[PDB]
């Protein structure tokens, strides 16, 4: 399961690669770049840029992405509720990153679902597959979880294959 | 960014993906940055091209609709929202928007009506829904009135709608009806708490006083309406002080003082006179609260002088006697007036104390120095600008005679609080404040009595404890809840001032003391219980409550720090151990044992200096300020074993209870040992029965006497033991007198 | 009464020679000294606070002795661990600690060091929530720890910084004491979720499913896979200024580094020694992992030092950094035990009887230690040295007028004949 997961996610990163690299080319904000590096499933360069842009704590936090530590998951979500109940202002991309640490980035109450309009469906699916709750789910039911949140274009065949894969039963 | 940053990125992805389809699929992400660079004729064409290839994306379609909204092209913007909505039905906010825009542009077509109906069922009775209902009608006077009335039938607690009724009355210049409804509505407990409503109440009344209709009609009911103005002023003052800024609050005081001066001249012995009495107290109390607000921001020299000044104000208020309740026409009116009286004595009371704890008999000095008429001018000076005429200002003309200068008694304070729980509609703000004010006192508040005053006939413990469905909510759950809310609140404020007294803040001045999560829960369970929920929102409210139940009962994934559980356990034991009835004793002891049984596994891991698994978004914030230490573990294990024994005794396992009680030589174990030895004696003491048994029966009564004496002997010697008594010292002595006369 | 002392120690020896395992002797010696440490400490002349500390020190010495000799001597050799390359770093760390006794000893010593570390009382009146003052003033555009790092620290209110100081200092003391669970509890409960999360990176990755040989201790994967990264990430964070000195101190300790001067200046022999053994340890593990290709090149973000000190050298340096403390006669024994050069020092202080007589505890301690040693390891201390030591201590039992309990000490020579 781990092997298969790693190959799938390396491949998705192969596909979304240029899209995101373009987006990083045009960003004017460092924390957003850090997020985009997480979009390429590159935890280390996110951590590094964080470090460099003087965002050190975040940097540490980032290092958890891809270990599925449920403690960290519920803590990140907690921080998010506390902000989303008062929290006079939190940077738009730090909240996104915390939402990634929460393990349920659309399935949620600070939801990245609106990124539906800014990214390839495959890009977001990468987010579910990499963070998302890898251990608790089978590859199939995980992918299915994601698909349940987003309609794919009828005509797109790589979409179709994911649907047939997730459809299992 | 600039124009160059975004138009240079054109060549960035143009050199990465050059085919027309991928060039157009980047249009949304191209348009994403032109919306940020203030380019709307350009951003429009970028998104519109992505829509040419990705015609089924609800996000892109909405984004163009939101962009056509900035362009004010209603026909185009609406259509865009429609497409995003028909693609994805979960976009409720867009169903409102469509309904919102259709009614603003043109109502002639029924399509605007249709979308408004859907918007209503997606947001049951929201504030915007009526707004749209009025907009659709706008496109005649009698017609508007019927809408408001039909709307008020099912939504009598809506602030905005009732305001509109007064405005419609005022538009037809039938002000008598405006005040009439205004008066009958001052009985509504919800509206009385609405800042904007009370503001409307103050105006519609004044307008009627000056109105030609008020004089012509008669001078008999003139007094009646005049009472409501003062009441409105009091409520409006309470609210303005909390939300509004320093300037606005002070300004409201001048209108209040003008009204008081204009009213005192009439006097008499009726509701108006009685109202003036109670409202007079409120004035100083709020004025004192107002004073303390200014000093908080100000320097230390002004603080002491202002707090000195405020202490006098609260004192004046507290002194004011309980208003003559019998003297009012109706049951509703008199109960209201008394409710406010309790609120005055309670709020001013705790303030008087918290300010007097600063120094020794600090209160005496305040009176001896500022009770002088010189203080009256120093009060008018600090509060108001001296330019205003000091003759018609009530503050400058009041006869400050024989200030009691007697600090309040706790027992009196408790009954003031309990009677004023319904003063501010039981807002968790109100209770969390009181709970904190009692956090510094040696006597604890009757929370269980507060909740009984709020949710009547809500069982102490629900039979169906197995599930967390919120039909099984119990006064214990609430009691357990408020305890955490206050235990949490105290720690949060303690942390705040440490970075920078917390007790000294008056109730209006301080901000939210609980987390919006906690407040949302209390407001939900309150609306649910009191039957003022919404058929549509019933399921949502119900689930909102359900979410937290499993934590109040320490079930799966409870966000409870071990210290808070222990606090719950002991706080319920001692709360229950002092109760008289068995039903209540059993329940509170049961829950206490329950929470204990959940902590001890944690304490054992903590006993060996290990780490506790921290929570995920807990309901009650964790703190290392009160993290349990090994120094206190053995005590809790002991204090818990008592709670176990107590429940064993109440259930019938006397043999094991005594065996446990006797193992630990604690003052509390004596009162339990004594109380259960006395019962075994009293029942068998006088019926015809074996003489040998009678001697054994007397022998128990002899043990009772001894244990009560050990309590008093150890009690009189040391003060720390007096505080450990599970019941009052005088109660222990009371039993002993009867025990020995037996 | 207190001039009972010798009895207690003597008493323990009685019980041992009479139930005819010897590690209990020392355990009791420890407890005995500790009990005495309490006596002189409670209510006392301020001439007693000194000899009270010399008893607490005494006690710690017996403890250290127990720990190390138990591990070294109760060594009955278990089964070797057979790893595969597919195995997680967690297992390799475990293997390392199993196979390398030299290094595990360092662990044992650090454990002892932590055991005896002082921690402040839990801060009271802690605030409801984090950076509340800054939020309330307005001006936190982001509520994340890194915000005032992204742009001037002028963002954070003074009181908030003051509280962050209270927190990070408390967390640091807890970390040096081994109280990792308490540190996580404090982080959680004090609304420092992100710092908590940082503290979670301490664990190497294990998966009970893959790393079979620990499918007992664990039911769920845990720990973090890209640890060399984590470690550089933390270390770099540690070097970034505009953080509270205790926070930086924490990250230093976590990265296997040496905390900043502002914090380190207050560390004593024990604290400092601890810090540097931690460094040895960290470096040695990461090297063990590199020699087995269980580190991935991507993670070598930054240079950390690769050369581990020897315990010998750490001791020498820490010594020269704390000469007064270093030279204290029981702490010399502490080091002597740590390096195993212990009979070495026995024979030594023996020849110092031929400014050891000036301090009372010493002659006793060395004697009872020598006894214990030859009991546990027959042959340990030279026959002569035992003779000389007991001879001199006995003559003090005489000077104290406790002839009563001299036979017990006699039970180690035919020289006893002469009494």
**How was it solved?**
cryo-EM
Per-residue burial over B588-598, b if 16 or more Cβ lie within 10 Å, else e, is bbbbbbbbbeb
Using CA coordinates, name the residue in chain B closest to A70: B616
* CB-based contact B16:A21 (threshold 8 Å): yes
* CB-based contact A131:A66 (threshold 8 Å): yes
Distance between CA atoms of B234 and B192, rounded to whole angstroms? 10
* CB-based contact B170:B178 (threshold 8 Å): yes
Kindly state the tokens that stand for B142. 């009698």
Distance between CA atoms of B246 and B292, rounded to whole angstroms? 11
Q: What are phi and psi of C190, to 5 degrees?
A: -105, 15
* CB-based contact B351:B434 (threshold 8 Å): no
Beta-carbon contacts of A108 under 8 Å, excluding residues fewer than 6 positions away, are A99, A102
Q: Which residues of C touch A63 (CB under 8 A)?
A: 201, 224, 226, 229-230, 233
User: Which of these, C396, C387, C398, C408, lies nearest to C363 by C-alpha position?
Assistant: C396
User: What CA–CA distances, in Å, run from C113 to C15, C177, C273, C329?
Assistant: 30, 8, 9, 18
CA atoms within 13 A on the CB side of A99: 24
DSSP structural state of residue C120: P
Residue B215 Cα to chain centre, angstroms: 42
* CB-based contact B64:B48 (threshold 8 Å): yes
Using CA coordinates, name the residue in chain B closest to C177: B609
Using CA coordinates, name the residue in chain C closest to B497: C127
Q: Please name the member of C220, C223, C240 whose beta carbon is closest to the beta carbon of A56.
A: C240
Distance between CA atoms of C22 and C19, rounded to whole angstroms? 11
Q: What are phi and psi of C156, to 5 degrees?
A: -80, 130
Distance between CA atoms of B488 and B245, rounded to whole angstroms? 27
User: Residues 111..130 of A with a Cβ closer than 8 Å to B: which?
Assistant: 114, 116-119
Using CA coordinates, name the residue in chain B closest to C127: B495
Distance between CA atoms of B711 and B719, rounded to whole angstroms? 12
Cα of first residue to Cα of last residue in chain A, in angstroms, is 18
Contact B6 A21 (CB under 8 A): no
Contact B32 A118 (CB under 8 A): yes
Distance between CA atoms of B607 and B601, rounded to whole angstroms? 10
Using CA coordinates, name the residue in chain A closest to C243: A56
Distance between CA atoms of C97 and B463, rounded to whole angstroms? 55
User: Which of these, B93, B19, B23, B83, lies nearest to B56 by C-alpha position?
Assistant: B83
Q: What does B56-103 look like in DSSP terms, one character per residue? A: T-HHHHHHHHHHHHHTT-HHHHHHHHHHHHHH-TT-HHHHHHHHHHHH
- Asked if A79 is an interface residue toward chain B (Cβ–Cβ < 8 A), one would say yes
Q: What are phi and psi of B541, to 5 degrees?
A: -50, -50
DSSP-derived 3-state class of residue C204: strand
DSSP structural state of residue C222: B
- Asked if C159 is an interface residue toward chain B (Cβ–Cβ < 8 A), one would say yes
Q: Which residues of C touch A67 (CB under 8 A)?
A: 205, 221, 223-225
Bridge partners of C204, per DSSP, are: C224
Length of chain A in residues, anyone?
Answer: 169
Length of chain B in residues, anyone?
Answer: 742
User: How wide is the angle at C-alpha A110 spanned by C-alphas A107 and A112, nearest 5°?
Assistant: 65
* CB-based contact C377:C73 (threshold 8 Å): yes
Radius of gyration of chain B (CA): 33
Kindly state the tokens that stand for C115. 């055991």
Q: Which residues of A touch C191 (CB under 8 A)?
A: 82
Contact C191 B493 (CB under 8 A): no
DSSP structural state of residue A115: G
Contact C160 B499 (CB under 8 A): yes
User: Residues 549..578 of B with a Cβ closer than 8 Å to C: which?
Assistant: 561
CA distance B243 to chain C (A): 15
In chain C, residues preceding a discontinuity (C to N beyond 2.5 A) are 20, 354
Beta-carbon contacts of B716 under 8 Å, excluding residues fewer than 6 positions away, are none
User: Which of these, B250, B156, B224, lies nearest to B194 by C-alpha position?
Assistant: B156
Q: Which residues of A touch B16 (CB under 8 A)?
A: 18, 21-22
Name the strand (E) or helix (H) holding C352.
Answer: none
Residue B298 CB neighbour total at 10 angstroms: 12
Q: Which residues of A touch B492 (CB under 8 A)?
A: none
Q: What does B234-283 look like in DSSP terms, one character per residue? A: HHHHHHHHHHS-HHHHHHHHHHHHHHHHHHHTT--SSHHHHHHHHHHHHH
Kindly state the tokens that stand for C49. 């606070």
Q: Which residues of B touch A151 (CB under 8 A)?
A: 56, 87-88
User: Which of these, B150, A48, B94, lies nearest to C235 by C-alpha position?
Assistant: A48
Kindly state the tokens that stand for B30. 């191209």
Kindly state the tokens that stand for B202. 């103050």
- Asked if B409 is an interface residue toward chain C (Cβ–Cβ < 8 A), one would say no
Which chains reach chain B with 3 or more Cβ–Cβ distances below 8 angstroms?
Answer: A, C
Residue C321 CB neighbour total at 10 angstroms: 15
- Asked if C181 is an interface residue toward chain B (Cβ–Cβ < 8 A), one would say yes
DSSP-derived 3-state class of residue A107: coil
Identify the residue among C133, C192, C194 best suited for mutation to test binding to A, counting A beta carbons within 10 A and taking the highest.
C194
CA distance B633 to chain C (A): 14
Contact B517 A81 (CB under 8 A): yes
Beta-carbon contacts of B203 under 8 Å, excluding residues fewer than 6 positions away, are none
* CB-based contact B237:B286 (threshold 8 Å): yes
Residue C226 Cα to chain centre, angstroms: 28
Helix (H), strand (E), coil (C) string for B585-647: HHHHHHHHHHHHHHHHHHHHHHHCCCCCCCCCCCCCCCCHHHCCCHHHHHHHHHHHHHHHHHH
- Asked if A157 is an interface residue toward chain B (Cβ–Cβ < 8 A), one would say no
Using CA coordinates, name the residue in chain A closest to B13: A22
Q: Please name the member of C127, C164, C170 whose beta carbon is closest to the beta carbon of B494.
A: C127
User: What CA–CA distances, in Å, run from C385 to C267, C362, C381?
Assistant: 37, 15, 7
CA distance C7 to chain A (A): 53
Identify the residue among B487, B625, B629 best suited for mutation to test binding to C, counting C beta carbons within 10 A and taking the highest.
B625
User: What CA–CA distances, in Å, run from B544 to A105, B340, B484, B528?
Assistant: 22, 32, 18, 11
Distance between CA atoms of B126 and B116, rounded to whole angstroms? 12
Contact C123 B605 (CB under 8 A): no
Contact B616 A73 (CB under 8 A): yes
Distance between CA atoms of B401 and C125, rounded to whole angstroms? 42
Q: What does B390-434 look like in DSSP terms, one character per residue? A: SSS-HHHH---------PPPHHHHHHHHHHHGGGGTT-HHHHHHH
Contact B621 C191 (CB under 8 A): yes
Residue B106 CB neighbour total at 10 angstroms: 12
Distance between CA atoms of B360 and B598, rounded to whole angstroms? 44
Indicate the burial class of B121 (C-beta count within 10 angstroms; 0-12, 13-18, 19 or more).
exposed
User: Which of these, B664, B613, B675, lies nearest to B642 by C-alpha position?
Assistant: B664
Contact A94 C193 (CB under 8 A): no
User: Which of these, B293, B183, B184, lies nearest to B238 by C-alpha position?
Assistant: B293
Q: Which residues of A touch B55 (CB under 8 A)?
A: none
Beta-carbon contacts of C414 under 8 Å, excluding residues fewer than 6 positions away, are none
Resolution (A): 23.0
Q: What are phi and psi of C359, to 5 degrees?
A: -110, 125
Q: Which residues of C touch B605 (CB under 8 A)?
A: 181
The region that residue B19 occupies, defined by phi over 0 for left and psi between -120 and 50 for alpha, beta otherwise, is beta
User: Which of these, C254, C310, C250, lies nearest to C282 by C-alpha position?
Assistant: C254
Kindly state the tokens that stand for B83. 């497409």
* Helices B58-70 and B27-34: angle between axes, nearest 10 degrees: 30
Distance between CA atoms of B294 and C409, rounded to whole angstroms? 80
Q: What are phi and psi of C327, to 5 degrees?
A: -75, -20
Distance between CA atoms of B244 and B249, rounded to whole angstroms? 6
Distance between CA atoms of A62 and A130, rounded to whole angstroms? 13
* CB-based contact C276:C309 (threshold 8 Å): yes
Beta-carbon contacts of A83 under 8 Å, excluding residues fewer than 6 positions away, are A90, A95, A110, C143
Bridge partners of C222, per DSSP, are: C206
Q: Please name the member of B26, B28, B613 whose beta carbon is closest to the beta carbon of A117.
A: B28
Length of chain C in residues, anyone?
Answer: 419
CA atoms within 13 A on the CB side of C418: 9
Kindly state the tokens that stand for A165. 């894969």
CA distance A32 to chain C (A): 13
* CB-based contact B116:B135 (threshold 8 Å): no
Kindly state the tokens that stand for B628. 């349990």
Beta-carbon contacts of A158 under 8 Å, excluding residues fewer than 6 positions away, are A122
Distance between CA atoms of B199 and B373, rounded to whole angstroms? 33
User: How wide is the angle at C-alpha A25 spanned by C-alphas A21 and A28, nearest 5°?
Assistant: 130
User: Which of these, B544, B575, B571, B604, lies nearest to B487 by C-alpha position?
Assistant: B571
The region that residue B545 occupies, defined by phi over 0 for left and psi between -120 and 50 for alpha, beta otherwise, is alpha
């Amino acid at each position: 399961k781990k092997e298969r997961h790693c190959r799938l996610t390396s491949w998705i990163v192969s596909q979304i690669g240029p899209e995101i690299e373009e987006k990083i080319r045009n960003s004017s904000n460092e924390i957003e770049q850090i997020f985009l590096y997480l979009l390429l499933n590159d935890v280390v360069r996110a951590s590094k840029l964080a470090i460099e842009s003087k965002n050190g704590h975040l940097s540490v936090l980032i290092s958890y992405l891809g270990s599925n530590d449920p403690r960290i998951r519920d803590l990140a979500e907690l921080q998010l509720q506390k902000w989303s109940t008062g929290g006079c202002s939190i940077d738009k991309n730090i909240s996104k990153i915390y939402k990634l640490l929460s393990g349920s980035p659309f399935e949620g109450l600070f939801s990245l679902k609106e990124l539906e309009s800014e990214f390839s469906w495959l890009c977001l699916l990468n987010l579910t597959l990499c963070y998302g709750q890898i251990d608790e789910y089978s590859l199939e039911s995980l992918v299915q979880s994601h698909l349940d949140k987003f309609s794919l274009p009828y005509d797109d065949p790589i979409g179709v294959i994911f649907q047939l894969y997730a459809a299992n039963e | 960014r600039s124009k160059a940053d975004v138009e240079r990125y054109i060549a960035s992805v143009q050199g990465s993906t050059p085919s027309p389809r991928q060039k157009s699929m980047k249009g949304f992400y191209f348009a994403k940055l032109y919306y940020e660079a203030k380019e709307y004729d350009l951003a429009k064409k970028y998104i519109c091209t992505y829509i040419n290839v990705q015609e089924r994306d609800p996000k892109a379609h909405r984004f163009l609709g939101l962009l056509y909204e900035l362009e004010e092209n209603t026909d185009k913007a609406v259509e865009c929202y429609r497409r995003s909505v028909e693609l994805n039905p979960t976009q409720k906010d867009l169903v409102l928007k469509i309904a919102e825009l259709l009614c603003k542009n043109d109502v002639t077509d029924g399509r605007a009506k249709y979308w408004l109906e859907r918007a209503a069922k997606l947001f049951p009775g929201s504030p915007a829904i009526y707004k749209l209902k009025e907009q659709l009608l706008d496109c005649g006077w009698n017609k508007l009135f019927d809408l408001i009335q039909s709307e008020l039938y099912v939504r009598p607690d809506d602030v905005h709608v009732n305001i509109r009724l007064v405005e419609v009355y005022r538009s037809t210049k039938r002000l008598k009806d405006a005040v009439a409804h205004c008066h009958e509505a001052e009985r509504n407990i919800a509206l009385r708490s609405s800042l904007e409503w009370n503001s409307c109440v103050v105006q519609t009344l004044k307008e009627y006083l000056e109105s030609l209709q008020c004089l012509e009609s008669d001078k008999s009911d003139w007094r009646a309406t005049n009472t409501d103005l003062l009441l409105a002023y009091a409520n409006l003052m309470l609210l303005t002080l909390s939300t509004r800024d320093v300037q606005e609050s002070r300004e409201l005081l001048q209108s209040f003082d003008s009204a008081l001066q204009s009213v005192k001249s009439l006097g008499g012995n009726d509701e108006l006179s009685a109202t003036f009495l109670e409202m007079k107290g409120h004035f100083y109390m709020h004025a004192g609260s107002l004073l303390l607000k200014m000093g908080q921001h100000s320097s230390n020299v002004q603080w002491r002088a202002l707090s000195e000044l405020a202490a006098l104000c609260y004192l004046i208020a507290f002194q004011v006697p309980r208003p003559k309740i019998k003297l009012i026409k109706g049951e509703a009116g008199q109960n209201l007036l008394e409710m406010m009286a309790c609120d005055r004595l309670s709020q001013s009371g705790h303030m008087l104390l918290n300010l007097s704890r600063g120094k020794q008999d600090f209160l005496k000095e305040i009176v001896e120095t500022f009770a002088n008429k010189s203080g009256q001018s120093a009060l008018y000076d600090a509060l108001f600008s001296s330019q205003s005429p000091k003759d018609t200002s009530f503050l400058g003309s009041d006869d400050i005679g024989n200030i009691d200068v007697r600090e309040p008694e706790l027992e009196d304070l408790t009954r003031y609080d309990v009677g004023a729980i319904r003063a501010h509609n039981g807002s968790l703000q109100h209770l969390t404040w009181l709970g904190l004010q009692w956090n510094s006192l040696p006597a604890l508040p009757g929370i269980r009595k507060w909740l009984k005053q709020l949710f009547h006939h809500l069982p102490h413990e629900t039979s169906r404890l197995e599930t967390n469905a919120p039909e099984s909510i119990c006064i214990l759950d609430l009691e357990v809840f408020l305890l955490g809310v206050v235990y949490t609140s105290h720690l949060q404020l303690k942390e705040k001032c440490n970075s920078h007294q917390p007790l000294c803040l008056p109730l209006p001045v301080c901000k939210q003391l609980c987390t919006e999560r906690q407040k949302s829960w209390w407001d939900a369970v309150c609306t649910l219980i009191h039957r003022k929920a919404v058929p549509g929102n019933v399921a949502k409210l119900r689930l909102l409550v359900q979410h937290e139940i499993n934590t109040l009962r320490a079930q799966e994934k409870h966000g409870l720090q071990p210290a808070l559980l222990v606090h719950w356990a002991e706080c319920l034991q001692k709360t229950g151990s002092g109760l008289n009835s068995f039903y209540d004793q059993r329940e509170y002891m049961g829950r206490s044992v329950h929470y204990w049984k959940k902590v001890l596994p944690l304490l054992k891991i903590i006993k060996k200096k290990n780490s506790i698994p921290e929570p995920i978004d807990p309901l009650f914030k964790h703190f290392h300020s009160v993290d349990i230490q090994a120094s206190e573990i053995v005590e809790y294990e002991e204090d818990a074993h008592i709670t176990f024994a107590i429940l064993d005794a109440v259930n019938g396992n006397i043999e094991d209870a005594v065996t446990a009680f006797e193992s630990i030589k604690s003052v509390v174990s004596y009162w339990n040992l004594a109380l259960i030895f006395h019962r075994k004696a009293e029942d068998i003491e006088n019926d015809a029965l074996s003489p040998e048994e009678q001697e054994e029966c007397k022998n128990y009564l002899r043990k009772t006497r001894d244990y009560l004496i050990k309590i008093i002997d150890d009690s009189d010697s040391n003060l720390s033991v007096v505080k450990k008594l599970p019941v009052p010292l005088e109660s222990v002595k009371e039993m002993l007198n009867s025990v020995m006369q037996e | 009464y207190q001039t009972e002392r010798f009895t207690k120690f003597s008493d323990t020896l009685k019980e041992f020679k009479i139930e005819q395992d010897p590690f209990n002797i020392i355990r009791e010696f420890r407890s005995a000294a500790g009990q005495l440490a309490l006596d002189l400490a409670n209510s006392g002349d301020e001439s007693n606070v000194i000899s009270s500390k010399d008893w607490e020190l005494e006690a710690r010495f017996w403890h250290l002795v127990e720990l190390l000799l138990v591990f070294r001597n109760a060594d009955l050799d278990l089964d070797e661990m057979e790893l595969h390359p597919y195995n997680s770093r967690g297992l390799f760390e475990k293997k390392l600690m199993q196979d390398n006794k030299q290094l595990y000893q360092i662990w044992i010593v650090m454990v002892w060091l932590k055991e005896n570390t002082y921690v402040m009382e839990r801060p009271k009146n802690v605030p409801t929530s984090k950076w509340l003052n800054s939020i309330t003033s307005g001006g936190l555009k982001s509520c994340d720890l890194d915000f005032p790092l992204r742009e001037n620290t002028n963002v954070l209110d003074v009181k908030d910084k003051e509280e962050d100081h209270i927190f990070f200092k408390y967390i640091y003391e807890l970390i040096l004491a081994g109280a990792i669970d308490e540190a996580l509890e404090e982080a959680k409960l004090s609304d420092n979720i992100s710092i908590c999360m940082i503290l979670c990176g301490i664990q190497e990755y294990l998966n009970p499913v893959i790393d079979t040989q620990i499918a007992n201790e664990f039911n769920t994967q845990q720990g973090i896979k890209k640890h060399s990264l984590w470690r550089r990430t933390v270390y770099s964070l540690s070097q970034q200024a505009g953080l509270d000195p205790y926070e930086r101190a924490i990250y230093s300790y976590l990265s296997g580094a040496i905390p900043n001067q502002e914090v380190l200046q207050y560390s004593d022999w024990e604290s400092d020694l601890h810090i540097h053994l931690n460094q040895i340890l960290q470096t040695e593990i990461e090297n063990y992992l590199l020699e087995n290709n269980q580190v991935g090149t991507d993670e070598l973000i930054l240079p950390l030092p690769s050369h581990a000190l020897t315990v010998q050298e750490v001791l020498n340096r820490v010594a020269s950094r704390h000469p007064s403390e270093s030279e204290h006669p029981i702490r010399v024994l502490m080091a002597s035990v740590i390096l195993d050069s212990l009979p070495s020092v026995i024979h030594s202080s023996v020849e110092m009887l031929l400014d050891i007589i000036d301090k009372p505890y010493l002659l006793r301690i060395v004697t009872h230690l020598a006894i214990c040693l030859d009991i546990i390891n027959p042959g340990s201390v030279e026959e002569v040295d035992k003779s000389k030591l007991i001879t001199t201590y006995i003559s003090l039992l005489k000077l104290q007028g406790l002839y009563e309990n001299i036979p017990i000490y006699a039970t180690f020579l035919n020289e006893s004949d002469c009494l």
